[PDB]
Amino acid sequence: EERMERKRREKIERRQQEVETELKMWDPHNDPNAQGDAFKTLFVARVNYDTTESKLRREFEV
Amino acid sequence: EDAPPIDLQAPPRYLLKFEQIYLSKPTHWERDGAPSPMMPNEARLRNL
């Protein structure tokens, strides 16, 4: 009853502590991959892995 | 651009001057209105 909660608390805290280290090292805004104005750029997810680059252009160029 | 600005007045007046154009790729709008790209093969088939 408690050993499970003890293990449940560490995995939550361990990640939370690991989160602070990543934010300090990596900068989201300062990303080489990211380019262009942020208000202009768009984000698309749940895209099929077989989607060719041209297929993604011709579908979002409309 | 070579067209003359249409100055109309009753007073208030309006010119309605055009400055630039933009021609996108061939597209098709269904009844729902979802803009989707239309391929030539789709046009020859759907008589579009």
Tab-separated table of C-alpha atoms in Angstrom:
chain	number	residue	atom	x	y	z
A	1	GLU	CA	0.000	0.000	0.000
A	2	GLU	CA	2.854	2.424	0.789
A	3	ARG	CA	5.780	0.953	-1.159
A	4	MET	CA	3.695	1.503	-4.296
A	5	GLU	CA	2.952	5.110	-3.334
A	6	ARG	CA	6.617	5.584	-2.421
A	7	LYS	CA	7.606	4.403	-5.898
A	8	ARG	CA	4.792	6.477	-7.412
A	9	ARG	CA	6.054	9.667	-5.749
A	10	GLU	CA	9.677	9.262	-6.862
A	11	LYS	CA	8.881	8.661	-10.538
A	12	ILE	CA	6.758	11.826	-10.463
A	13	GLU	CA	9.377	13.864	-8.603
A	14	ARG	CA	12.311	12.378	-10.531
A	15	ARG	CA	10.778	13.563	-13.804
A	16	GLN	CA	9.854	16.939	-12.305
A	17	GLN	CA	13.487	17.386	-11.241
A	18	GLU	CA	14.650	16.199	-14.669
A	19	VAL	CA	12.316	18.788	-16.224
A	20	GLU	CA	14.168	21.688	-14.595
A	21	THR	CA	17.494	20.510	-16.029
A	22	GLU	CA	16.206	20.322	-19.611
A	23	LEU	CA	14.658	23.805	-19.629
A	24	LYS	CA	17.977	25.345	-18.573
A	25	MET	CA	20.003	23.482	-21.212
A	26	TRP	CA	17.676	23.533	-24.236
A	27	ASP	CA	15.980	26.706	-25.477
A	28	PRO	CA	12.720	26.294	-27.451
A	29	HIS	CA	12.886	29.705	-29.139
A	30	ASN	CA	16.593	29.308	-29.989
A	31	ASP	CA	16.053	26.283	-32.226
A	32	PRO	CA	17.913	26.007	-35.567
A	33	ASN	CA	15.083	23.942	-37.056
A	34	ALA	CA	12.516	26.613	-36.180
A	35	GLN	CA	12.643	29.525	-38.620
A	36	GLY	CA	10.443	32.339	-39.862
A	37	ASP	CA	7.894	34.425	-38.014
A	38	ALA	CA	6.088	32.524	-35.271
A	39	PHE	CA	2.689	34.047	-36.055
A	40	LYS	CA	3.083	32.974	-39.701
A	41	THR	CA	4.263	29.403	-39.093
A	42	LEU	CA	1.693	26.617	-38.734
A	43	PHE	CA	1.703	23.243	-36.976
A	44	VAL	CA	0.145	20.033	-38.326
A	45	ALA	CA	0.174	16.707	-36.458
A	46	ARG	CA	-1.427	13.254	-36.681
A	47	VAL	CA	-0.087	13.158	-40.246
A	48	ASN	CA	0.276	9.763	-41.896
A	49	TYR	CA	3.882	8.589	-42.080
A	50	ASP	CA	3.500	7.783	-45.800
A	51	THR	CA	2.665	11.416	-46.641
A	52	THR	CA	5.154	12.591	-49.258
A	53	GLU	CA	6.612	16.073	-48.903
A	54	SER	CA	4.916	17.161	-52.132
A	55	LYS	CA	1.614	15.725	-50.889
A	56	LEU	CA	1.890	17.853	-47.744
A	57	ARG	CA	2.701	20.951	-49.809
A	58	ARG	CA	-0.105	20.526	-52.348
A	59	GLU	CA	-2.683	19.885	-49.605
A	60	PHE	CA	-1.749	22.899	-47.448
A	61	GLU	CA	-0.983	25.251	-50.357
A	62	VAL	CA	-4.708	25.635	-51.095
B	1	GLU	CA	-3.287	48.223	-62.636
B	2	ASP	CA	-4.106	49.716	-66.048
B	3	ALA	CA	-7.778	49.936	-65.064
B	4	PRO	CA	-9.022	53.370	-63.954
B	5	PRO	CA	-10.067	53.827	-60.314
B	6	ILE	CA	-13.864	54.038	-60.215
B	7	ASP	CA	-14.678	57.330	-58.460
B	8	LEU	CA	-18.388	57.350	-57.589
B	9	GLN	CA	-20.321	59.839	-55.469
B	10	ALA	CA	-23.972	60.637	-54.817
B	11	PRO	CA	-21.017	64.044	-50.735
B	12	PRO	CA	-19.138	60.816	-49.973
B	13	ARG	CA	-17.053	59.272	-52.737
B	14	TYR	CA	-15.184	56.004	-53.251
B	15	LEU	CA	-12.354	55.037	-55.607
B	16	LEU	CA	-11.897	51.274	-55.009
B	17	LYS	CA	-8.336	51.076	-56.328
B	18	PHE	CA	-6.598	47.740	-56.911
B	19	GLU	CA	-2.897	47.329	-56.169
B	20	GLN	CA	-1.824	43.673	-56.380
B	21	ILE	CA	-3.052	40.195	-57.298
B	22	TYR	CA	-2.450	36.658	-56.061
B	23	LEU	CA	-3.223	33.496	-58.047
B	24	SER	CA	-3.162	30.320	-55.966
B	25	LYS	CA	-3.046	26.778	-57.312
B	26	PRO	CA	-6.094	25.093	-58.869
B	27	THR	CA	-8.623	24.321	-56.146
B	28	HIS	CA	-12.123	22.918	-55.706
B	29	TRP	CA	-14.750	23.826	-53.101
B	30	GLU	CA	-17.327	21.172	-52.225
B	31	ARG	CA	-20.772	21.840	-50.756
B	32	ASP	CA	-19.375	21.878	-47.213
B	33	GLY	CA	-16.873	24.509	-48.380
B	34	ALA	CA	-13.686	22.657	-47.422
B	35	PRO	CA	-10.936	23.958	-49.764
B	36	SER	CA	-9.158	20.976	-51.309
B	37	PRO	CA	-6.691	20.697	-54.202
B	38	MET	CA	-8.038	19.330	-57.482
B	39	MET	CA	-5.867	17.154	-59.700
B	40	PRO	CA	-6.217	17.191	-63.505
B	41	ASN	CA	-7.253	13.532	-63.454
B	42	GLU	CA	-10.012	14.495	-61.011
B	43	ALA	CA	-11.214	17.206	-63.406
B	44	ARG	CA	-11.266	15.025	-66.527
B	45	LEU	CA	-13.317	12.512	-64.516
B	46	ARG	CA	-15.724	14.769	-62.596
B	47	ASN	CA	-16.240	17.042	-65.636
B	48	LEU	CA	-14.951	19.994	-63.616
